Design a protein around this nucleic acid. Structure first.
Ligand SMILES: Nc1nc2c(ncn2[C@H]2C[C@H](O)[C@@H](COP(=O)(O)OP(=O)(O)OP(=O)(O)O)O2)c(=O)[nH]1
Ligand SMILES: [Mn+2]
Ligand SMILES: [Mn+2]
Length: 430
DNA sequence: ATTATGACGCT
DNA sequence: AGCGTCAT
């Protein structure tokens, strides 16, 4: 009733770049533009592993985690760009720098939370109030929302996708009450106007296209963003949630795509997000824990409180390489050489970070995996990071891991190492 | 022999 | 602190 909070207090957007690494390579090399193309890491094994795919190539069934040789069977004309290799490993610097370009543009409009290399949440509540006071009760023209979809519309009473988009937008705009500056639907609409401007700025100033979601919280904004890709944005209103969730598989909601979501499905005997509404908060807490249970109870009603954190920079800076099958490291010289390669990349990135961002990392985390273990990490150990010196960090990493060598011969390494990882953490202002 | 990360929760 | 989960 009057006291039942509805989670409509904020306007939150999620901006995610379309096929990011592909767009970075297409900007650099115009010959790849408007083509089926993909970005690969390495080349000798099955043509390299695909990590990003243009929408033209997706039409042929090309996906991430596919080997390039197999993708070429689906799409013989597929074009490929390779990630840079430095010190024997993949180097993602080009894409991190392109990410900074986009993040700095978004930060002009509002404080952002960097959620990944290619996506950020935006809290637009205050910008929306400002724009509403500027509008002075003026209604919002469809011309201000030229790439916006309104989820759930059109409804009720022609055969083109753009025509349906405009039909839905006109239904939405016709139903709007522009007199009330507190109306959540109006606030979301103004938020979408701002996100159109943000996305136009990103494309004008970088050449990159993106999609976006606009809703009242982070989970709904992320889900909305996915509904109309590429190069479009989607408004998910509070009122759209019952219908949207009534056929939404639980795994589509961020954080429910793994073991927890599978357990929701199995324990409760349901398939769709909306079915969660029939359980009490205590029932959900009893199965999934106090925190998850409260989160699910609110989330299946469209309500989530997780704040957009003011954080534009990554919290950690890390370097990792797998050594699969026969390439696994089985000598001490090998382990030391590769720890040095990783540490040299880490030193480069840390020194640039300190110059750009006025901070220093203080803890070095070393992670390995040994032959046989299905786990991502077989062991993690931390030590002090007191100097941005690659030889020092590699010697310290070796010191903290060397007790894993069960070979009585110190020259051999047994079992062989199938992963090395170095991560700088615990930043302090400098 | 998908690979390279990065965030956050649990105990 | 070290380990697991989830994102992709
Ligand atoms: N190294 C590495 N990079 C990855 C991996 N998965 C994704 N990436 C990179 C390449 C992607 O372009 C970028 C952003 O990922 P997204 O999930 O947002 O997909 P992408 O932007 O490629 O396409 P989309 O957002 O669906 O239009 O992250 C991976 O497993 N390893
Ligand atoms: Mn993306
Ligand atoms: Mn993304």
């Amino acid at each position: 009733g009057p006291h039942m909070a509805t989670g409509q207090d904020r306007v939150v957007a999620l901006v995610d770049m379309d096929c990011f690494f592909v767009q970075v390579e297409q900007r650099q090399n115009p010959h790849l533009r408007n083509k089926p193309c993909a970005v690969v890491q390495y080349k000798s094994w099955k043509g390299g592993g695909i990590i990003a795919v243009s929408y033209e190539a997706r039409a042929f069934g090309v996906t991430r985690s596919m080997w390039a040789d197999d993708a070429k069977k689906l799409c013989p004309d597929l074009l490929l760009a390779q990630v840079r290799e430095s010190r024997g490993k993949a180097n993602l610097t080009k894409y991190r720098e392109a990410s900074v370009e986009v993040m700095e543009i978004m930060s002009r409009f509002a404080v952002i939370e960097r959620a990944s290399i290619d996506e950020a949440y935006v809290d637009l509540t205050s910008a929306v109030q400002e724009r509403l006071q500027k509008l002075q009760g003026q209604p919002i023209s469809a011309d201000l929302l030229p790439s916006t979809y309104i989820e759930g519309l059109p409804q009720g009473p022609t055969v083109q996708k753009e025509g349906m988009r405009k039909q839905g937008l006109f239904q939405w705009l016709d139903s709007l009450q522009i007199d009330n500056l507190t109306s959540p639907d109006l606030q979301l609409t103004v938020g979408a106007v701002i996100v159109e401007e943000m996305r136009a700025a990103i494309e004008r100033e970088t050449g990159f296209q993106c999609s976006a979601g606009i809703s009242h919280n982070k989970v709904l904004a992320k889900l909305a963003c996915g509904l109309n890709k590429p190069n479009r944005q989607t408004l998910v209103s509070h009122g759209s949630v019952p219908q949207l969730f009534s056929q939404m598989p639980i795994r589509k909601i961020r954080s429910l795509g793994g073991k927890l979501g599978a357990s929701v499905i199995e324990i409760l005997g349901i398939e769709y997000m909306g079915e969660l509404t029939q359980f009490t908060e205590s029932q959900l807490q009893s199965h999934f824990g106090e925190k998850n249970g409260s989160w699910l109870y609110a989330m299946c009603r469209g309500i989530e409180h997780d704040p957009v954190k003011p954080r534009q920079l990554p919290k950690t800076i890390g370097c990792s390489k797998n050594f699969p099958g026969k390439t696994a490291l089985a000598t001490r010289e090998q382990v030391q050489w590769w720890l040095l390669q990783l540490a040299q990349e880490l030193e480069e990135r840390l020194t640039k970070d300190r110059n750009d961002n006025d901070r220093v990392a203080t803890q070095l985390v070393v992670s390995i995996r040994v032959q046989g273990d299905k786990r991502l990490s077989s062991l993690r150990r931390c030590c002090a990071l007191t100097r941005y010196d690659a030889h020092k960090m590699s010697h310290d990493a070796f010191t903290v891991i060397k007790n894993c060598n069960t070979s009585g011969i110190q020259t051999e390494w047994s079992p062989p190492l199938t992963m090395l990882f170095l991560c700088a953490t615990k930043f302090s202002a400098s």
